[PDB]
């Protein structure tokens, strides 16, 4: 969660037709800015898309004509737009404007100081309920930075080579085994087995819980359950099944390699728990900027006929990974 974050402005480009404004670089992210409100190399507070940052016109005037409504409270949700013909991702604006943080620099979460929160659509009715407990602390929740984000480490990590995957668009499932304990878990919370979850009703038309106990290992089987009803049902599925793209070692701590883990994905289909796996597509030694590797985002999906939401990318060792997200997808399906 880093939502708004004290950055340091990139190259600044004008943008054509009219000088009123200008284009300005925060780290993989462009956005457009008022001409005369930032200096290259100059500090500033970076709102990412999906934050939600309530009504404020000393603070937040150019977000005054998209305040909309949501939970009650209320502000403007900034998702990706094109503001006169310049794609533009998120809010940068100068530390003036924030008198009460000029103690902070660079690398500052300061998402809980200003409030900010994160948007989130409507999270489908048969995704969560009976709550068991909280997701168990020795596994690894599911996030993928934006590579975006990761300008230093990208260049930095080159020479690396990387397993690459569709990125699928339903929500995240873990489930998993410690000892006797076979367990269920959606992004947050350990869920209950009850009559109609999903999650736990995906997990048992596979056997996956019957291919853990067999593995005799504490294992972790994170991917991700799309179908039906879930984000408007991208790929056109019928019903709802797991796709697998993590698998997390709790004893050691870390996640399985890509060849561990599809070695371990066929060690289960051999043995009749038949479990998908996310698309795989070739596996990528980086050499690549930013820009290249959001290039690659756009394409087919599982369904070869339909746009991906993008690409998530893990270095073979298992120990870094991103995700690269089309920009096209998000102009699409602008209730993302
Ligand atoms: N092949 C894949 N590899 C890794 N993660 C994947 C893959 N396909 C889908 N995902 C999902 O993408 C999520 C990480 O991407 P992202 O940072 O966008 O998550 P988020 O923004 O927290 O939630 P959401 O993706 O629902 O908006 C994971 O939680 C995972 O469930
Ligand atoms: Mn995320
Ligand atoms: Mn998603
Ligand atoms: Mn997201």
Redesign the pocket.
Known sequence: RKLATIRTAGEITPIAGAEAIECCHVDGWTCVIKKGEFKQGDRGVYFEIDSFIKEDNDRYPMLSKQVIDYEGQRGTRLRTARLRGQLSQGLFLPMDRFPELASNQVGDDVTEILGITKWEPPISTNLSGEILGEFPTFISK???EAVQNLIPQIEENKGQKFEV????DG??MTVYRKDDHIGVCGRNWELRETATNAQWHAARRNKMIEGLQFLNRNLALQG?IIGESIQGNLEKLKGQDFYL??IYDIDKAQYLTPIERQSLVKQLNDNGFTVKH?PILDDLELNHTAEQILAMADGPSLNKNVKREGL?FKRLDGKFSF?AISNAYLEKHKDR
């Not at 995957?165 to 699928?168: M, P």
């Open positions: 599911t996030d993928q995957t569709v990125k699928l929500s995240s991700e793209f993590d996310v998530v995700k």
